[PDB]
Structure formats: structure tokens, C-alpha cells
Design an enzyme around this catalytic site. Structure first.
Site, PDB file in Angstrom:
ATOM      1  N   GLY A  29       1.139  -1.168  -0.060  1.00  0.00           N
ATOM      2  CA  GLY A  29      -0.304   0.051   0.570  1.00  0.00           C
ATOM      3  C   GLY A  29       1.141   1.384  -0.178  1.00  0.00           C
ATOM      4  N   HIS A  47      10.096  -4.295  -0.524  1.00  0.00           N
ATOM      5  CA  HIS A  47       9.708  -4.181  -1.092  1.00  0.00           C
ATOM      6  C   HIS A  47      10.072  -2.679  -1.668  1.00  0.00           C
ATOM      7  CE1 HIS A  47       7.242  -1.458  -4.656  1.00  0.00           C
ATOM      8  NE2 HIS A  47       8.328  -2.305  -5.535  1.00  0.00           N
ATOM      9  N   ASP A  89      10.851  -3.874  -7.888  1.00  0.00           N
ATOM     10  CA  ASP A  89       9.780  -4.359  -8.679  1.00  0.00           C
ATOM     11  C   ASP A  89       9.183  -5.776  -8.833  1.00  0.00           C
ATOM     12  OD1 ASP A  89       8.751  -1.742  -8.201  1.00  0.00           O
ATOM     13  OD2 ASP A  89       8.721  -0.658  -9.507  1.00  0.00           O
TER      14      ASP A  89
END
Lengths: 121, 121
Positions: A29, A47, A89
Site C-alpha cells: 500500500g 519491496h 518491482d
């Protein structure tokens, strides 16, 4: 940039990125990091940490190239930062896919839920 | 914060904010901006651009005071940024209400990776 990230997440997981990961657990998020809730959440933790080592480039805004040949994400050369961004990513998209089996809708939220502070990057 | 914004959206639109606007089109909710799919979406695009102008406060986490008086959102704080954030949120809530006429439920959970690049703010 968010565009490549979202596409990779879709490509790997087959899930609507925003819906499944735009607000999930403590790390998936846009509300920073937190003590991961599950494997999926841990992916987003790594990440976010990955984004921190990036130097100079903007993870949210900078576009980079990557190929999807043979349904595998290959970060194009681009440049050091963009390349590293791309790998961050790619990694999270793959990780999320890898952890689909324990993905739990209960960790989705609209408003930030209870999180402890991510042990940090 | 998302809390006030959501309450405003519910107040103005009468729709559950998460469901109807948490991931609508290319600009409402996660994964930044993209070219607006419609008027509702454009409200969110404007909203995100509005946020970009905030100096010193966090739209995600900073709470602020506003009143709903005679069914009108009235922003409260003396705090300059918080007032501006509140105004950004009021404006989007109003805009979403105004465009409920074209709200396209199909765009609810629109796959953001399909979105075209957005013009910058």
C-alpha cells in the site's frame, strides 16, 4: 514507476494490483511499512526496503523499461538506478505471485489497520 | 486523512467511499494518476493534483477538523496546510457527488495497468 510496478504485479499475480495490494497488511500500500502480517505483506516490506537503497531516482514516478518475454520480467538495462528500481518491482511482483496461496483478504483495509513498526530496512 | 476524506465522500455522495471510490478509474485510490476515464475519475485526478500542492502535512495520515453544517462541508483549522488538505478533500467529495450521474460501476476496480499516462498537474 507505479505504472510498471502495477503492470508487473498484474502480470505475475493476475490480480488487480490496487485491489489486492493497494491496501493490504502493513506494507502493501501507500502507508509505509510495518510488521508484516503474512508472506504477501512481507513481500511488500522487502519491496519498500528495496526502494530505499535506490539512489536518485523516483520509484513512484520514474518510468523504466522491462520486457515480459516468455512471461518473465526482464529489467532492461536502463541505468543503474532505474535497473535497480525495476528489479525491486520485479521482485515484489514475483513474491506476491509466489505467495498467492496464503493471500488473505482479511488483511485488506480502507483505513490503515493496526501495525507495529517494521523492524526496518 | 483518509478518514475525513472518506467521511466527506460518504456525506456528499452517500456511497461507501472504499467501495465506490477506493479504486475507481485511473485516479481514484492507489497507484497514482493516469488519464481520467471519466468525470468521477477526473475529480480524483484533480484531487491528487490538489494534494501535490500541500506543504507540510500528510494527506494520508494527518487528521484535520471540518464540520458538516447544513449538509455542507466546512473546513476548520487555522493550520494552513491542514485547511488546504481539508479543502482538497471537500472539493473531491463535492466533485464525486456532482458526477455521480456518470459514475461507471465498471470502473469500480478498474485495472489501473490499462491506464494511459496522465498529464502532469
Amino acid at each position: 514507476s507505479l505504472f510498471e510496478l502495477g503492470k508487473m504485479i498484474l502480470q505475475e499475480t493476475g490480480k488487480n494490483p490496487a485491489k489486492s495490494y493497494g491496501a493490504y497488511g502493513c506494507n502493501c500500500g501507500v502507508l509505509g511499512r510495518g510488521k508484516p502480517k503474512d508472506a504477501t505483506d512481507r513481500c511488500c516490506y522487502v519491496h519498500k526496503c528495496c526502494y530505499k537503497k535506490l539512489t536518485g531516482c523516483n520509484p513512484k514516478k520514474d518510468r523504466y523499461s522491462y520486457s515480459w518475454k516468455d512471461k518473465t520480467i526482464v529489467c532492461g538495462e536502463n541505468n543503474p538506478c532505474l535497473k535497480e528500481l525495476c528489479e525491486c518491482d520485479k521482485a515484489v511482483a514475483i513474491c506476491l505471485r509466489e505467495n498467492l496461496g496464503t493471500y488473505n483478504k482479511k488483511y485488506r483495509y480502507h483505513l490503515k489497520p493496526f501495525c507495529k513498526k517494521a523492524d526496518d530496512c
